């Protein structure tokens, strides 16, 4: 029993974190095979950042403008290229600890583990959800750029996030491992801000199924609802609209609990309209939306506490 | 910015998890140097558990009654002993991935990272606090016994918890790495239950200091309080009594924010009496008590957002 925000074991990623220095700036890089990936703003000064032209800044650098430190060892750069908002540094040594890996672009609402690193040294690990406004509510200080987000399936690491910046409201933005930003953000110092956010409806429903799997049914009711009638309530409370694709995704959790998806939507509607009456669900006084259906199946028992 | 329940990177511990089999039971073990540690109830059957005599059960086993699997490799047991509620198995191979480590017994209210493992394979990582009633609110299924809790200081792993059981309310109990249980629990199937719990006052205060460090002061007031007047309110709301030792511990966080400890206690008293008025603190609608002062200093900036 129990239900926690649970990250993937981070060991496979720890053996890939390095330090990258360009001039006076140091940040983290990701060392896979003979390549080190890091944010391209490592080549910028404080003044460059206000209006950088990265093509023009990078042509002025050589291979020996970059220092890569893997633990105690210096790695020699033998090539460099830019891929969107990432710098790719070729190094003289293949990482012996390179795991089986993939680069994936995750979708809003999906979750991943974050390995916070400073000066190439892993510092902490926690679980994050990609918000609908393409930010994450991470925990990051200066020096955290280059930190990565990942999922692990069996022995294969799926890297999906590299950290680049913190926005004025304190939330965080970055790229996939092809250097394409999540969201409309850019790596320059401008007045950009995160857009308005919304609650991840699919995740709230998955989490309510987790509560039933783990033995709690107090929030259910005798009612059902249509997609359209639920989405009218969802609009009022700033929830994402429920789609038929989301209904189909909840199929297995609906089958394990015997609660039809639209019946659980009637439960959620009632929770939104009446509140929770000073009760808790899986220890929470609010509706959690940072667990996907996959996270619930990963963590919960396959047998419901009936 | 940001503030998350953050675990230590788990890689150093992952390289120490093995599988231990005795008869039909399989659970996790901790492999350090030439020794594997695991719960002694691995030698019990379902019937033994109702009333086991572990001295009598263990004398009936040989070295080859135990199978240890480290990844793909079988480790040969060459010795076995019991230390309190743990089995110690000597094996023919020293773990090459053994980190610098220590065994510590943590105190109630302190936190640690948990590496959940099944069949000797790490599954997930999350952060837990030792409750005052000597349980932890973990996330564990059958097969999780032998999973360990740890902290990491620099490159030294301080193991403090090994998982043994889940209690009727769904919370978890276990031992230190000398096999002594936290709390009054025993490794046999009886009617034992977790005692009544209480809120960790020192941690709530540390977390309020984190909120101020990160830029939020809405919950402060112009009042101060004495230790005794606070503890009268603490008794009413099921908070641990505040001691002078706890006041001394908060010294550095008080210095960084310029908020005297007894002034922050006046703030907390007002929060307990008036509620939070539909506001949040560091994203939470409730008062968090699973962050120690050490956790706050570890994660927060050393400069306050004034
Ligand atoms: C704070 N401000 C921005 O982060 C920022 C804002 C904008 Br608008 C654009 C960029 N940009 O184009 O890179 C930004 N990144 C900074 C500029 C140069 C590259 C790295 C810089 N950021 C960090 O070091 C950083 C990351 N995470 C959490 C932090 C917490 C405290 C202090 C710093 C950080
Ligand atoms: C459930 N019941 C107890 O866990 C239990 C209760 C008491 Br009272 C005493 C013991 N005791 O003396 O060991 C217990 N451990 C069981 C007995 C043999 C040793 C391992 C057993 N437990 C687990 O496998 C287990 C651990 N964590 C979370 C779980 C979630 C679901 C199912 C199982 C677990």
Numbering used by the authors:
A (entry chain A), B (entry chain A): 1 to 306
Task: Show the paper's wording.
The 3C-like protease (3CLpro) is an essential enzyme for the replication of SARS-CoV-2 and other coronaviruses and thus is a target for coronavirus drug discovery. 3CLpro is a cysteine protease with its catalytic dyad consists of His41 and Cys145.5,6 Most reported inhibitors targeting SARS-CoV-2 3CLpro are covalent compounds derived from peptidic scaffolds that have an electrophile to react with the catalytic cysteine (Cys145).6−19 One such covalent inhibitor, PF-07321332 (Nirmatrelvir), has been approved for the treatment of COVID-19 patients. Here, we report the development of specific, noncovalent inhibitors of 3CLpro.
In a fluorescence-based enzymatic activity assay in which the concentrations of 3CLpro and the fluorogenic substrate were 100 nM and 100 μM, respectively, WU-04 potently inhibited the SARS-CoV 3CLpro, with an IC50 value of 55 nM, while WU-06 showed no activity. Consistent with the enzymatic assay results and the binding affinity, the key residues of the inhibitor-binding pocket of SARS-CoV 3CLpro and the interactions between these residues and WU-04 are almost identical with those observed in the SARS-CoV-2 3CLpro/WU-04 structure. The anti-SARS-CoV activity of WU-04 was measured in Calu-3 cells and in Vero E6 cells, and the EC50s were around 10–19 nM.
